[PDB]
Amino acid sequence: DKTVRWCAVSEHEATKCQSFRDHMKSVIPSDGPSVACVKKASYLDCIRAIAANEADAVTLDAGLVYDAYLAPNNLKPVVAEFYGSKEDPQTFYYAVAVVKKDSGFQMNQLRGKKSCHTGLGASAGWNIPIGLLYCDLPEPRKPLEKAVANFFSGSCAPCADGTDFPQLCQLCPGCGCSTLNQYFGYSGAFKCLKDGAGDVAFVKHSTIFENLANKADRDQYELLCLDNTRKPVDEYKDCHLAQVPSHTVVARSMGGKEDLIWELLNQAQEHFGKDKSKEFQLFSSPHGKDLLFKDSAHGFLKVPPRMDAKMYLGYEYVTAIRNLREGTC
């Protein structure tokens, strides 16, 4: 069934990808689907490679999946991740704003604070939180990047150009767009909050649970709700900024090997899915969190035939992005 050149971003993913290829080869029959690893510096390069036919697949955050659709790459979502459980799969998750208990400020008081973002253009770490604070931001608001750097008093927005918007890398100099940046991603934005570099971390509802196994430690943290109040991390369903589409694997539209990508992932979630193997795991890793696929994922679901990004993502979230990228006050 040929090979799916998987795009790994940086060395940790590269390692897990190499492990993914070995283990798959050790079980799936010589005729089945195999995996190859193409290592890139950022998801941006991953998107260029796939569109150039030097790679075939990569998993992306909804917001990045939207971007991958715009020309001249026009990549399509082919396999989505689902969370929660296999019995009740959820193809969405909750963006939340985590903070340290007794920090003393609600949502309408973020101005002047320090922000820890998962990454620029990501749903929970950027599109959702910045969309909601769009008008609180100082004018001019365009370019957005600079208005955000001005609203807060120091941030970490991975993938942002540190040369044009220095304050966006104040909490993580260089704004590295990969695990090389320790404050990159969910658990990265959380560590930025925990080490005390920032005051708030825009991540997902499961992030803190992936980092603090003891409730005692977690009680020293809270969520900022939309009604300008705070609630425990356990109460995200009623204290989140928004609900968003699940991360999804994207591929080319022509000669995209979507059937093979899915066949590879479906067989892979049976062999190495949640609690399935003692040799290898798809949704966890000894080299780091959320490498290739997010840790909170429980499996995969095949995206309907020929579906494009707009359709998959859905109108509500597409609008949310269009509004943030346009919108007025």
Q: Which residues bind Fe ion (CB under 5 A)?
A: 61, 123
Instruction: Give the one entry of K ion, Fe ion, none that residue 61 binds, where binding means its C-beta sits below a cut-off of 5 to 8 angstroms depending on kind.
Output: Fe ion
| Angle in degrees, CA 51, 52, 56, rounded to 5 | 60
Instruction: Give the one entry of Fe ion, K ion, none that residue 150 binds, where binding means its C-beta sits below a cut-off of 5 to 8 angstroms depending on kind.
Output: K ion
Q: How many CB atoms lie within 10 A of CB 47?
A: 24
Cis peptide before 129 (omega within 30 of 0): no
Instruction: Give the one entry of K ion, Fe ion, none that residue 123 binds, where binding means its C-beta sits below a cut-off of 5 to 8 angstroms depending on kind.
Output: Fe ion
Between the alpha carbon of residue 67 and those of residues 30, 37, 219, 251, the distances in Å are 36, 23, 37, 13
Q: Binding-site residue total for K ion (CB under 5 A)? A: 1
d(CA 266, CA 153) in angstroms, rounded, equals: 45
Residue 150 or 182 having the CB closest to K ion: 150
d(CA 104, CA 102) in angstroms, rounded, equals: 5
Does residue number 150 form part of the binding site for K ion (CB under 5 A)?
yes
Q: How far is the CB of 124 from Fe ion (least distance, A)?
A: 5
Q: How far is the CB of 239 from Fe ion (least distance, A)?
A: 18
Q: Which stretch binds K ion (CB under 5 A): 10-18, 144-152, 249-257, 307-315?
A: 144-152
Angle between helices 62-69 and 43-52 (to 10 degrees): 40
Residue 89 or 166 having the CB closest to Fe ion: 89
Q: How far is the CB of 139 from K ion (least distance, A)?
A: 14
Q: Minimal CB distance to K ion: which residue?
A: 150
Residue 190 or 280 having the CB closest to Fe ion: 190
Does residue number 113 form part of the binding site for K ion (CB under 5 A)?
no
Burial class of 308 by CB neighbour count within 10 A (0 to 12, 13 to 18, 19+): middle
Identify the sign of the CA torsion 176, 294, 33, 11. Answer: positive
Instruction: Give the one entry of K ion, Fe ion, none that residue 269 binds, where binding means its C-beta sits below a cut-off of 5 to 8 angstroms depending on kind.
Output: none
Residue 154 or 245 having the CB closest to K ion: 154
Does residue number 145 form part of the binding site for K ion (CB under 5 A)?
no
- Nearest Cα to Cα of residue 109 among 153, 149, 166: 153
Binding site for K ion (CB under 5 A): 150
